[PDB]
């Protein structure tokens, strides 16, 4: 159920990323079927915004690098992510991962490929629980990250 916490973190982050640009999307399971999801969201959001300003300084906006189809999406996610983390995991890399994930969702809605949002969420969840969890647990878990953004 450490996996579930990672899933709900992903679900809330994407929900707000889309909510704030006028598309509604909700995949939380907390019920029906200051919570970790909410507080991690806020840090992820602040740390990802610092990222973006840095990024966009120097480079074109990431949405223009995607190319954007229901066929290409899996390859796109997998190629960038594996590239990002190939020689290691750290907090800023994890921050960029989530930021990257977010613009993919945002672009998917843009490109009238809304359902892709749901694929990206579950790709992000399983990448976390398969490849990022151990490192995060070893570095004080998510609680250590939120406290860096107090």
């Amino acid at each position: 159920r450490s996996g579930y916490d990672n899933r709900e973190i992903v679900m809330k982050y994407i929900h707000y990323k889309l909510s704030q640009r006028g598309y509604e999307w909700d995949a939380g399971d907390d019920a029906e079927e200051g919570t970790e999801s909410e507080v991690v969201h806020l840090a992820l959001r602040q740390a990802g915004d610092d990222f973006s300003r840095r990024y966009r300084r120097d480079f074109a906006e990431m949405s223009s690098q995607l190319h954007l189809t229901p066929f290409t999406a899996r390859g796109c996610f997998a190629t960038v992510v594996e590239e990002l983390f190939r020689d290691g995991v750290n907090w800023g890399r994890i921050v960029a991962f989530f930021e990257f994930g977010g613009v993919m969702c945002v672009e998917s809605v843009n490109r009238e490929m809304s359902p892709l949002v749901d694929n990206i969420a579950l790709w992000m969840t399983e990448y976390l629980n398969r490849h990022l969890h151990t490192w995060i647990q070893d570095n004080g878990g998510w609680d250590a990250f939120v406290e860096l953004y107090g």
């Binding site: 740390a47 840095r54 990024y55 190319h67 066929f71 190629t79 960038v80 907090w91 800023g92 921050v95």
Partner: peptide, 26 residues
């Protein structure tokens, strides 16, 4: 069948740009 090399290059390129912008602590 198929992703164009042209698009694959862009993802490679995107990944490296991302990595160059990472601060370790966040």
């Amino acid at each position: 069948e198929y992703i164009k090399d042209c698009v694959f290059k862009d993802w490679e390129e995107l990944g490296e740009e991302i990595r160059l912008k990472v601060f370790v602590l966040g």
